[PDB]
Amino acid sequence: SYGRKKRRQRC
Amino acid sequence: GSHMSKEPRDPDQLYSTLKSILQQVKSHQSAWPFMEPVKRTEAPGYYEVIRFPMDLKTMSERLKNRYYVSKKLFMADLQRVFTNCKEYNPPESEYYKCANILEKFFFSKIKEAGLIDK
Questions:
Q1: Given an 8 Å threshold on Cβ–Cβ distance, is A3 in contact with B42?
Q2: Which of B42, B73, B88, B104 could, after both became Cys, cross-link A9 (CB 3.0–4.6 A)?
């Protein structure tokens, strides 16, 4: 959803 | 008015000019967020709202290599960091403040330098 600018998505 | 100049005249002249706008932007009290790279892998929105994310963390490395020593060439990535970051960041909460100040301060330089000619 739109930009994010958050932590690193740990997959 | 309608002219759209955006003429850097001399390339070298731009090298130190963009270095001027940047030099004050690198030490700006609000360019902290622009001094880092986004996710480019897990940051939803980019590659769509942020055509050219760019960031001083990687953009400032070009002014040293003359990778953006011209009119829109350098203003593109810089204006991009300001316009793309705002395309998602709050209209005025934490990120906008920087993109707003930086966009406002560097303007007087790029406008007088011959970048925005407006």
A1: no
A2: B42
Closest CA to B20 of B96, B118, B112: B112
**Can you tell me which residue has the tokens 């290599």?**
B65
CATH of the structural domain B1-118, one choice from 1.25.40.10, 1.20.920.10, 1.25.10.10, 3.90.180.10: 1.20.920.10
Amino acid A10 reads R
Solved using: NMR
Query: CA-CA distance, B85 to B60, in Å (whole number)?
Result: 17
Beta carbons of B49 and A3 less than 8 Å apart: yes
What is the longest distance spanned by two Cα atoms in chain A? 20
Q: For chain B, what are the domain ranges?
A: 1-118
Q: How far is B87 from chain A (nearest CA, A)?
A: 8
CA B61, CA B45: separation in Å to the nearest integer? Answer: 25
